Write a protein that binds this DNA or RNA. Structure first.
Ligand SMILES: [Mg+2]
Ligand SMILES: [Mg+2]
Length: 132
RNA sequence: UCGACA
DNA sequence: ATGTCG
């Protein structure tokens, strides 16, 4: 019951909080469709969030109706709420990731999308295809 | 007091 | 170890 005609997204980090990146892959072929340059400090959930929103923008710009898979219950709820409820301290260190988070929320609040955001079922299907 | 997703 | 929600 994997919807193979989909985009899969994931975060990778070194530390948490720590250096965060993310990418999106074609679920069928594994081809890397986008990959964000590493952000010096962020959280896992911030990156999972940014990855979904990036995915929405990617698909919207390309007139694609493909769903997005994420394994993150947290990020899926933050996107649905249009609100990233991160605990990470907002200070000079974390300014870049908070800026990105702010700009993602703002995109969600200025655009429509129909993309279904689906939970990847890691316990049945193994690791999401975007995994680092 | 946990249970779960990362 | 930490970041998050139910
Ligand atoms: Mg993940
Ligand atoms: Mg993962």
């Amino acid at each position: 019951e994997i919807i193979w005609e989909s985009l899969s997204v994931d975060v990778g980090s070194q530390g948490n909080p720590g250096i965060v990146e993310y990418k999106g892959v074609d679920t069928k072929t594994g081809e890397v469709l986008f990959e964000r340059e590493p952000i010096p400090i962020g959280t896992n959930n911030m990156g999972e969030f940014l990855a979904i929103v990036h995915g929405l923008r990617y698909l919207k710009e390309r007139n694609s109706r493909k769903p997005i898979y994420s394994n993150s219950q947290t990020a899926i709820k933050w996107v649905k709420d249009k609100k990233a409820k991160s605990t990470l301290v907002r200070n000079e260190e974390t300014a870049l990731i908070w800026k990105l988070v702010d700009e993602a929320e703002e995109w969600l609040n200025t655009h429509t999308y129909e993309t279904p955001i689906l939970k990847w079922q890691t316990d049945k299907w193994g690791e999401i295809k975007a995994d680092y």
